[PDB]
Design a protein around this ligand. Structure first.
Ligand SMILES: Nc1ncnc2c1ncn2[C@@H]1O[C@H](COP(=O)(O)OP(=O)(O)CP(=O)(O)O)[C@@H](O)[C@H]1O
Ligand SMILES: O=C1CN(/N=C/c2ccc(-c3ccc([N+](=O)[O-])cc3)o2)C(=O)N1
Length: 206
């Protein structure tokens, strides 16, 4: 198994896109924090996988640096991937960031750190068919960018996951991957494109 994604080396990120790169990472983390509470997890300072405690379920500004850069790099690689495919990212609607409210969840979503997930309310954002094929294609690539970095840290396949060896049952080709995870990647990058549009960006191939 060889996870080779679209080559992101012959690509640079213009400084005017660094703004979305920062906000895109925030929203992607907000969506993660919500889904994690939605499935048995809570806040903690000493991670114990059996107790469902997590230190990363905090606001984007309070994250540790090791996990933080990974969220900014993956966000930067996502933008660069669109550029490597021949698509452009450009601001057109200047009032969209002001007309971008955030989702507010029930009271039970607040934990012992003062953090309560508040992703952007992007439910009223519609995508054209061409942008759907992009999100589906971007999703398969996000699996490869994740799998390549893990592989060089020694991560291979293993029936049981493990935070102390390089084992993970999802280190497999996108075809041999459970459709739940495949759909999860598509949903994540569907909001990624909606995050751009929510800030006033038009995605358009050259
Ligand atoms: N599938 C995904 N899509 C977008 N961001 C993800 C992600 N998985 C993890 N992240 C980001 O990674 C950061 C936390 O890193 P961590 O190592 O704790 O992942 P994790 O605990 O979710 C492993 P798993 O999801 O398999 O149980 C989180 O703040 C989150 O934003
Ligand atoms: O088990 C798994 C896990 N995984 N992806 C995990 C990685 C970890 C960090 C992120 C990440 C993605 C996108 C952005 N972004 O664009 O901002 C920011 C961070 O995904 C996968 O494919 N199968």
């Amino acid at each position: 198994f060889i996870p080779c994604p679209v080559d992101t080396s012959q690509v640079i990120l213009p400084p005017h896109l660094e703004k979305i790169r920062d906000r895109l990472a925030e929203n992607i983390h907000e969506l993660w924090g919500m889904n994690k509470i939605e499935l048995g997890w809570t806040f903690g300072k000493i991670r114990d996988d059996n107790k469902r405690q997590h230190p990363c379920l905090v606001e984007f500004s309070k994250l540790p640096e090791t996990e933080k850069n990974y969220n900014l790099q993956m966000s930067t690689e996502t933008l660069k991937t669109l550029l490597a495919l021949g698509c452009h990212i450009a601001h057109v609607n200047p009032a969209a960031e002001e007309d971008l409210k955030k989702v507010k969840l029930p009271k039970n979503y607040m934990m012992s750190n003062g953090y309560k997930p508040a992703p952007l309310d992007l439910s009223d954002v519609k995508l054209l068919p061409p942008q759907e094929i992009l999100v589906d294609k971007l999703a398969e690539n996000a699996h490869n960018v994740w799998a390549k970095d893990r592989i060089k840290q020694g991560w291979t396949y293993g029936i049981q996951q493990d935070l102390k060896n390089k084992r993970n049952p999802r280190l497999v080709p996108y075809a041999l991957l459970d459709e739940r995870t495949k759909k999860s990647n598509r949903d994540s990058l569907r909001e990624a494109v909606r995050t751009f549009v929510g800030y006033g960006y038009n995605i358009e191939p050259s």
